[model samples]
Target: SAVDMDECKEPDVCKHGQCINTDGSYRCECPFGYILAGNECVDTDECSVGNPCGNGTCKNVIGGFECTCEEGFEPGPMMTCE
Candidate 1:
């Protein structure tokens, strides 16, 4: 009898992503704001491209991005400064 083991049961199977159990193995599916890199999920640098933080500073964080508004300005929706 062939026994199919569920590898997803193991802790830290997919450090920063979701684990999908396969017949003989498992796969890691990175969540939004992240990308698969050599079996690991890395943060997507949204700040590296377009000005996501209008009139503010864009900082890339794990699985997401943060915005720092300038003096006299407040953080608004979509990383915009108001």
Candidate 2:
């Protein structure tokens, strides 16, 4: 059968990445903060390094991390809230 088709273009398989075509197949490559797990694009836990939130609490969010400060604190000079 002389069939010509681009599999990567039709399905849009990669959820959060690029689709690379290989020998009659396709693969996905995630971005910096994402990983291919459970056949899905899962974001990495950046706050796992401890103190990423500085004085605030570290909360894991979709595709990213969030730092929240209590009532008394304000957004610090850098990424911290003090």
Candidate 3:
């Protein structure tokens, strides 16, 4: 009998994201601000995609991005400034 292994239980299987067990392998499910590259998940530059923080400066981080709101403005939900 052939046995199917749960690859998700292994360490670093998905690198920087969640591991999905398959029939005999696994897939990587990256979180926000990350993308699947080859067999690992890598950080994605959200700031370069577009202006997420309106009237604010977007700073890319490891697993997310931060916004520096302008004067009289404060950081709001969804990377926007209010």
Alpha-carbon RMSD, each predicted model? 3.3, 4.4, 3.2
Clashes of 3: 0
lDDT of 3 by residue, 1-82 (tens): 6657756555556676777778878878887768876656778877775556776687676666667777666775445556
TM-score of each: 0.66, 0.57, 0.64
Runs of candidate 3 with Cα error greater than 4 angstroms are 1-4, 8-12, 76-78
Which tens-of-lDDT digit does each residue in 1-82 have in candidate 1? Answer: 6757656555545557777879999987788888866565667887787445675687776655766766566665444455
Q: How close is candidate 3 to the true structure, as a TM-score?
A: 0.64
Clashes of 1: 0
If the candidates were sorted by their lDDT against the true structure, best first, what order would they fall in? 3, 1, 2
- Stretches of candidate 2 exceeding 4 Å from the true structure: 1-13, 75-82
Q: Candidate 3: minimum summed lDDT over ten consecutive residues — where?
A: 73-82
What lDDT is reached at residue 78 by model 2?
26
- lDDT tens string, model 2, 1-82? 7454444455345566666767687777776667766445557766665545566676555565666666566653324455
Best by TM-score: 1
